[PDB]
Design a protein around this ligand. Structure first.
Ligand SMILES: NC(=O)c1ccc[n+]([C@@H]2O[C@H](COP(=O)([O-])OP(=O)(O)OC[C@H]3O[C@@H](n4cnc5c(N)ncnc54)[C@H](O)[C@@H]3O)[C@@H](O)[C@H]2O)c1
Ligand SMILES: NC(=O)c1ccc[n+]([C@@H]2O[C@H](COP(=O)([O-])OP(=O)(O)OC[C@H]3O[C@@H](n4cnc5c(N)ncnc54)[C@H](O)[C@@H]3O)[C@@H](O)[C@H]2O)c1
Ligand SMILES: NC(=O)c1ccc[n+]([C@@H]2O[C@H](COP(=O)([O-])OP(=O)(O)OC[C@H]3O[C@@H](n4cnc5c(N)ncnc54)[C@H](O)[C@@H]3O)[C@@H](O)[C@H]2O)c1
Ligand SMILES: NC(=O)c1ccc[n+]([C@@H]2O[C@H](COP(=O)([O-])OP(=O)(O)OC[C@H]3O[C@@H](n4cnc5c(N)ncnc54)[C@H](O)[C@@H]3O)[C@@H](O)[C@H]2O)c1
Ligand SMILES: Nc1ncnc2c1ncn2[C@@H]1O[C@H](CO)[C@@H](O)[C@H]1O
Ligand SMILES: Nc1ncnc2c1ncn2[C@@H]1O[C@H](CO)[C@@H](O)[C@H]1O
Ligand SMILES: Nc1ncnc2c1ncn2[C@@H]1O[C@H](CO)[C@@H](O)[C@H]1O
Ligand SMILES: Nc1ncnc2c1ncn2[C@@H]1O[C@H](CO)[C@@H](O)[C@H]1O
Ligand code: NA
Ligand code: NA
Ligand code: NA
Ligand code: NA
Lengths: 430, 429, 429, 430
């Protein structure tokens, strides 16, 4: 007596499938997993609950997991990130998915709850992005923990929570930190946001980037990619940071590094990338230039004080979905994107498929590792082996017509490494 | 007679919201309203406009009307109209004949609706690409003597005006707006640097990083497109016929080679030439699987779209203005906007700030032709550099730029007028 | 009369090695030799040259002589001569009067040595900055009627020629070489993009990354300097008087503000304006400790070096052309080349490849004036675009650029001559 | 009866000192070490043999070590890298230094040998760059190993050798890997080469970079900085790589990635950054464009087959010191810089002082750590703690007028980190 799926409109499935066909040909890593593992079904018996943005790219991941033998039930990890045509294609394929663009907060929790119970038992595997599923099970369903073989977690904020849980003795299931595979953190977080930040801002506002001042809070992998994107289109980018290493990197790249208390007086565009609370406050809003555009690309909507705008503005004018223009008591306006939620996924389409193929090949490898080799993974937070990380990159070279050099026997001897790798030590930072 | 024809008048309130936002990004146009709304220099003008019916053009239209003009409008491309912008103009009582996704015959019909006003025929033309200009000269020559001037937006259109003049077939004075410095060095360059990628992303969502992109032409548009693609991590190859532009591209770190070679390597193809026959069947047959092919020159003449329609073995519509073809060789081609301007056809065109430069020039040109026609004999003219500088100066405050003023000692040293113009006529910026 | 005067003739063999290398980077000049060494179009010319006596200028000189000219040379800056290049020219029998580190009076003496040849006075001028031009007009007017033409290298020099003409004091025809497209859009831009940093590094070895650099002026030189500094991770602030150039800089992501504000923030200061009074005592007093201050405009008029010499409390010579001043406020200023052109004074000037563009134009100008004087009445002229294009085309093979040729169908469509010129006279590239 | 120092010309000392005065004001990290530690003399009793490029920056490091109480004896780690005015200033200060520009190979070994014996005993500390000193002691003087408290090693190739020594049981002294402090690897290797590669090429050749094709072998930290530099001046950069991760990074940045076997036919400039043997061979030279410029910026001269040029060219024309133009049997010419030795230090002045202040503040901290806290460092290869790494960056922010943000109490609580750091986990890659 439970719903089999819930999506905005299953009639979008044919359009979704056309988008999936295109994405497949951009995602050689996931397609290679299908080629290598579709016959052997390494994920047979797995019942994976997934809580991850229900986009075209995630649909290609889902269909990969099913091809490898898993049963899957899916929800989005953000109320605005679902792409309804992609959700439709997954629903039409008979895969239980509970996701649509523009969920309420109650609906959001309800969708995760729909993914826990399969025909043959509760979930026995977690694929998570931000830890909402991880936390739901630990807090509300501790009785299911013993039946879960593993967690794989996508994002910086999510893995931060796993490490914290482990340090406080709260984590009861082995986890693989997918965010910090080299082929995820150094590619998705960086090159993904270099494209999808501007895409979100443009689809929402059509604003010219050239000539503006843009303030980016944080200069981690996300902030590095965001700053590069904005600079490339001729914005003058000002960085805020708490970490003196990241701040020196920003300075050495030619950006002004100062505080939000100063930068709020100058910015025309504000982008938060910190994963931290209380980045853009009332005291900042009141000093901004007229029609300042304010958005967040950190995982949770905790960075911008949107409550302050709702409570203090004279009026909120909705321009279109996920775009609101607040009129302040000082007579100036603030353009807020996606209610302070992830702007790339909320206002556009998130990262393009090619780079998501790197992140999602890591996800598939992690599910296989945890499902088929559980002895290797005691309760704790683990990384994929470098040889697998390198395999993810290698799987994407062909599409780009990259010609990789092979070490000669003599060179391999000289370097003291194997011809087939791994080629770097464990601490290597790329 | 219809008061207008648009897709959906119900889009007017959303259109108006977009216009409100755009006004705040278009200080040059708003300054024209501030300066001239009371004196109404365009009183008596009946301007027929043929120019992409976007949010930005709506702000231009309402500026012309604030200055006293009567206006009737059409788009200059069948896919470029933004229906909410057209609806806002219609709702405001201005005759606009435009919608996204016109047939070719509807396109001509819409231009024809702009010719006749209550008081008489058009007496001014505002054109982007020369279609209105050419229509009048070829089909309505009886109206020519009643037209005081033409202002022309785009490189292809001014190219046509010069050709008409050299052949003695131009019959009305024109101002070349494209070649104001504040148009050609801004709109064509920085405009495309943002809107090309916007069109490609909304259509395909393709990653740019890691791709080879081939840009045909390295003029102002090609310079902007190339820079955009390179900034996102594409490896950009350029084609060119002009050895100066080719040397510029090589000096910027781009490989310059022929389309005959580059067709074997590109994952993305962008035509910027203004020229016929740039991407042909012999090129398509050599392209990497799922190569994305698009045009950003004014007319759809650069890519042989007829060839794909005739020779592909499969053709699948992915979504509006996105088609995926399967060739006899088994590989796929993705074609955007049927080879029409991709930025306006698949996205929203250039952002409003840079369009404020172009459209401030347009307002100035219309005022010059309407109020000082004797300064402009039949021929093709530029705006004075003093006005060109004034366009740029009007956009500095929004960006909080602080311009330096020469001292009288410095102005004497330079032999320069202290308020400009600051550069000689041949200066290239 | 001396056959020459140089620092050290013993440097000739090393000079020759540097010339051999430079020739292989200068295909335009070598092509002029290939084409014209036999026909000798400059037979009869007695060219007095006043232009930085560098390796690149040596290749130019030997090209003029291969074409049949007699030549006598001086540098146009007291610090720009490359003594090995001067020695190679001297050793080859060409009268050159130049060395690095001339006094002001030696500088004038050297120019004066170039005026008289065995057969009579100079009959052609090749100038960079107008000093030879001005010397003849002001001090030797009796020689004017014997001079067939002037070709002038640099923006400041052509500025002077236009001023002379407008005032009716220009008495010899001139060709403006600076404003060939293949000069101004290449040498001024890409040349400075490499040689500014070269001068700053050889003088100071300072890290650029992490600094604030202030560039005064955003013309061709300022565009090149700014790009260079930004590429190494400096945060670049721009000053400008021209609202068009200012808007260009803002659209490229640079803060544009006044020197009055920017003096408080810069760690590096580069003047590119061609104008007097850019960096003054009131600016020095506000600068960060050990701010590096340099000029890349033609004349040393931009920085108030007199102020530092008079008001500093300590002045230490660090090495040739590098001085470190201590002000009354306790902070230090590092001044390069006594405010003279830093790229040529502290390094080697622009690299040979881009100078081949400039100097191919120079050879063409000299041939035009010498062999077709009646085409050039007293006044200031440009080379034809066809020749400008030919300069760029002559450099494409070295870079393995493959230029596309229009088809006859495409040329008909465009109304363009199939071999060029490909752009209208007003084109800005 | 041993020489007290040996330098090209001690008369250069006054000029050297002027350069040192300038460098000090660019090196706030080293100056802060002097301010903090000059009175307490933490390095009293230390007798440090240093084998590291005898440049102006190294002179500031040497004077820092002496201010902190150490006795020091110094040699260069490259035959072309010494800056004679800097060596003169150190000699004049009474510090035994044995280094000059243009040493022969016999002289080079002799100089290291001069640094082993102090008035009060043999060396008891090693400061090394490339491991030549480390290897000399282990191979030729094993009897001195027990009296050495620690090794600090500067460069990637040197630390590679330490790890290899440790894995083979050959390492007998505790070492700190300074190369892989974040504030070294991510700054010196990257931003240092972004400036000093081009400086070396230009001082040697004055070649135009714009319009050329440049081939960079390797896309590690050095190759990343080299590629960026060349691209910035308008060269078209082609990358070679053996590591599929680094190669994907290059591709995602817009570079063509192919093999040297292909790229040799196209390049006008070749830069080797690999740390590996046999990168540019005879078969490559014979296919290059005329006047191709060939140089190496990896630590040892093992990357370019210079022997092949000496044996096969028709003639070698010396242009000036460290610049040779070989005429090949095919009639084309090759311009070889610094005999295939480090081009930035051999043909110009190496990295600028500011970034070397980061590397050398790490060196001073490592010497203090090994000298004063030996119990923390058993025989093995160790990293500096992240808190010290962060302290190095923080010490350079003031000079750049960077304003770092401080976390609020509430934010620190939210993130689960201390207000004063460290701010990142141990695996963070920046
Ligand atoms: N939207 C997306 O597609 C996308 C992609 C990847 C990651 N993420 C999310 O983005 C956020 C950042 O990820 P990351 O990988 O860049 O993490 P990171 O740890 O690499 O970077 C975050 C940076 O924020 C800085 N910071 C923290 N508090 C700050 C403050 N109060 N003011 C200024 N700076 C502060 C930190 O010093 C750190 O350098 C995370 O929430 C992550 O989950 C989003
Ligand atoms: N879509 C837009 O928003 C937009 C904006 C501005 C201009 N335009 C249009 O874009 C086109 C280009 O404009 P522009 O200002 O760059 O003109 P342009 O004259 O500056 O540049 C076009 C370049 O194409 C090169 N070219 C011509 N034929 C070629 C061929 N067969 N192969 C390779 N190169 C060739 C020319 O040498 C020239 O340098 C025109 O049609 C113009 O009207 C479009
Ligand atoms: N050192 C070299 O190798 C080299 C090379 C080429 C040109 N030059 C010289 O460099 C100078 C600049 O040449 P250009 O081609 O860039 O000329 P330009 O006219 O293109 O640019 C100079 C810029 O300075 C700006 N300017 C003038 N006075 C100013 C002031 N007081 N404050 C701020 N900006 C001001 C102008 O608006 C102009 O845009 C000239 O002296 C020229 O002869 C030197
Ligand atoms: N000259 C300097 O001032 C300077 C500065 C720092 C480091 N170094 C030296 O530079 C070299 C590189 O240092 P790094 O920090 O960049 O090391 P790295 O390990 O980060 O980079 C070297 C790269 O070379 C690639 N590589 C190895 N063999 C190759 C081959 N045969 N062909 C193509 N690529 C190959 C590797 O995959 C690796 O990515 C080392 O020798 C280091 O000691 C020099
Ligand atoms: N198109 C996409 N589909 C699925 N996840 C995405 C997309 N773009 C970004 N993400 C993921 O969103 C996460 C933040 O929740 C990032 O770590 C990133 O990996
Ligand atoms: N958003 C826009 N609205 C109106 N015209 C535009 C827009 N974007 C680009 N164009 C114009 O389209 C012309 C090509 O037809 C260009 O010359 C440019 O000025
Ligand atoms: N290496 C060089 N040799 C000769 N002239 C140069 C060099 N570098 C720059 N210049 C010239 O110096 C002029 C300024 O005096 C510039 O116009 C430029 O053409
Ligand atoms: N100016 C310099 N002085 C001393 N060492 C340097 C300089 N430039 C580069 N290096 C060092 O040379 C090492 C390679 O031997 C690099 O790891 C780098 O830290
Ligand atoms: Na997508
Ligand atoms: Na718009
Ligand atoms: Na030179
Ligand atoms: Na130095």
């Amino acid at each position: 007596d439970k719903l089999p799926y819930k999506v905005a409109d299953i009639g979008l499935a044919a359009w979704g499938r056309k988008a999936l066909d295109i994405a497949e040909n951009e995602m050689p890593g996931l397609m290679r997993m299908r080629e290598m593992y579709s016959a052997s079904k390494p994920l047979k018996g797995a019942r994976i609950a997934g809580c991850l943005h229900m986009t075209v790219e995630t649909a290609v991941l889902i269909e990969t997991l099913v091809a490898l033998g898993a049963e899957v039930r899916w929800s989005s990890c953000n109320i605005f990130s679902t792409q309804d045509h992609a959700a439709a294609a997954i629903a039409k394929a008979g895969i239980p998915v509970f996701a649509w663009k523009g969920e309420t907060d109650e609906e959001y929790l309800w969708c995760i709850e729909q993914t826990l119970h399969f025909k043959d038992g509760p979930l026995n595997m977690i694929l998570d992005d931000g830890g909402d599923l991880t936390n739901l099970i630990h807090t509300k369903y501790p009785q299911l923990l013993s039946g879960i073989r593993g967690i794989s977690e996508e994002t910086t904020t999510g893995v931060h929570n796993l490490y914290k849980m482990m340090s406080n003795g709260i984590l009861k299931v082995p986890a693989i930190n997918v965010n910090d595979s080299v082929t995820k953190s150094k590619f998705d977080n960086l090159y993904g946001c270099r494209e999808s930040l501007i895409d979100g801002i443009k689809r929402a506002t059509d604003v010219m980037i050239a000539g503006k001042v843009a303030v980016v809070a944080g200069y981690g992998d996300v902030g590095k990619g965001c700053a590069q994107a904005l600079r490339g289109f001729g914005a003058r980018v000002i960085i805020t940071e708490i970490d003196p290493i990241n701040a020196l990197q920003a300075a050495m790249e030619g950006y002004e590094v100062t505080t939000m208390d100063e930068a709020c007086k100058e910015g025309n565009i504000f982008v938060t990338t910190t994963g931290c609370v209380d980045i853009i406050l009332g005291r900042h809003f009141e000093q901004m230039k007229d029609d300042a555009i304010v958005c967040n690309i950190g995982h949770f909507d905790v960075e911008i004080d949107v409550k302050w705008l709702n409570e203090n503005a004279v009026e909120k004018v909705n321009i279109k979905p996920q775009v609101d223009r607040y009129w302040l008591k000082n007579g100036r306006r603030i353009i807020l994107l996606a209610e302070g939620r992830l702007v790339n996924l909320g206002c556009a389409m998130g990262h393009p498929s090619f780079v998501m193929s790197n992140s999602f090949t890591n996800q598939v490898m992690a599910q296989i590792e945890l499902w088929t080799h559980p002895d290797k993974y005691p309760v704790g937070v683990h990384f994929l082996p470098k040889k697998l990380d390198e395999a993810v990159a290698e799987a994407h070279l062909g599409k780009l017509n990259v010609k990789l050099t092979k070490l000669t026997e003599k060179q391999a001897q000289y370097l003291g490494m194997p011809i087939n790798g791994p080629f770097k030590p464990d601490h290597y930072r790329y």
